[PDB]
Amino acid sequence: MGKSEEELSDLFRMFDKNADGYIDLDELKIMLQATGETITEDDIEELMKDGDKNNDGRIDYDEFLEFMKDVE
Ligand SMILES: [Ca+2]
Ligand SMILES: [Ca+2]
Fold first, then answer.
1. Is 3 left (phi over 0), alpha (psi -120 to 50) or beta?
2. Spacing, Cα 20 to ligand 1 middle (Å)
3. Residue 55 assigned ligand-binding role
4. Cα 60 to chain center, whole Å?
5. Given Cys at both, which of 5, 11, 15, 17 links 23, Cβ 3.0 to 4.6 Å?
6. Helices in the chain by DSSP H: which ranges?
7. Tell me: domain 1-72, CATH 3.30.200.20, correct?
8. Would you call 36 helix, strand, or coil by DSSP?
9. Are 35 and 23 in contact (CB under 8 A)?
10. Closest by CA position to 61, among listed 3, 30, 6
């Protein structure tokens, strides 16, 4: 938070699971598998709608930077 694009770049690394460069809804499920939660596909897709400008069902590094640039 605090209007920082660099923080968004670091957080994107936390979201991708295969080191493939794109966050897919299934890579996002692995983050919930780490918490031990079962996720429905819409929960992951609604999270993408907040910041994914394309609404493509996957967050690119650039789409991820768009999600929380400001948070202030
Ligand atoms: Ca990925
Ligand atoms: Ca996307």
1. left
2. 4
3. no
4. 8
5. 15
6. 5-15, 25-35, 41-51, 61-67
7. no
8. coil
9. no
10. 6
